[PDB]
Amino acid sequence: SERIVINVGGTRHQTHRSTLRTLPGTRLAWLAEPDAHSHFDYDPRADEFFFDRHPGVFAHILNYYRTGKLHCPADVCGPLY
Amino acid sequence: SERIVINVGGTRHQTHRSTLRTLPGTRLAWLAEPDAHSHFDYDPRADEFFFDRHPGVFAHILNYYRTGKLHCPADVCGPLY
Ligand SMILES: [Zn+2]
Ligand SMILES: [Zn+2]
């Protein structure tokens, strides 16, 4: 019950709930809480939350959650990120 | 949402909810209702209820639910059935 799988635009991003729980107040912080099945899109057959967003930049967002420093991917426009 | 899978001792018995809903008051009748996830053993990963019983005779119990006539399997003792 420590692992959580985010399905962002069809790409499965997997992480521990502690990682999401680091940065409070943000959307993924609300994901990490146990009252998240009702709040967010979720299918119990695969145990994944689905967000209809660009996955390539969510990699860097989740990297912010993991390491603690926010960086900009040099392969997307400024406004996109 | 019309199909329901019963896992009886490791053998998957599949049926429609109407079939279970035919005979009221019995255990499978309570299974057919929408408030059955909490009442009974159930895992959302496979969407199956698990009962730790002999499956070979549950075949005949479910056949009672389907056809409407209760028969005894001639391959098990009287007290077992
Ligand atoms: Zn641009
Ligand atoms: Zn016997």
From Swiss-Prot, chains A, B:
It is linked to Epilepsy, progressive myoclonic 7: A form of progressive myoclonic epilepsy, a clinically and genetically heterogeneous group of disorders defined by the combination of action and reflex myoclonus, other types of epileptic seizures, and progressive neurodegeneration and neurocognitive impairment. EPM7 is an autosomal dominant form characterized by myoclonic epilepsy apparent in the first or second decades of life. Cognitive function may decline in some patients. It comes from the Eukaryota. Zn(2+) binds at residues 71, 77. It is found in: Cell membrane; Cell projection, Axon; Presynaptic cell membrane. Homotetramer. Homomultimer. Heteromultimer with KCNG3, KCNG4 and KCNV2. Heteromultimer with KCNC2. Heterotetramer with KCNC3. Interacts with the ancillary subunits KCNE1 and KCNE2; the interaction modulates channel activity. The chain holds residues 7 to 87 of 511 of the full protein. Belongs to the potassium channel family. C (Shaw) (TC 1.A.1.2) subfamily. Kv3.1/KCNC1 sub-subfamily. This is Voltage-gated potassium channel KCNC1. The modification Phosphoserine is found at residue 38. The segment S4 is probably the voltage-sensor and is characterized by a series of positively charged amino acids at every third position. The N-terminal cytoplasmic T1 domain is involved but not required for Zn(2+)-mediated tetramerization. Voltage-gated potassium channel that opens in response to the voltage difference across the membrane and through which potassium ions pass in accordance with their electrochemical gradient. The mechanism is time-dependent and inactivation is slow. Plays an important role in the rapid repolarization of fast-firing brain neurons. Can form functional homotetrameric channels and heterotetrameric channels that contain variable proportions of KCNC2, and possibly other family members as well. Contributes to fire sustained trains of very brief action potentials at high frequency in pallidal neurons. N-glycosylated; contains sialylated glycans.
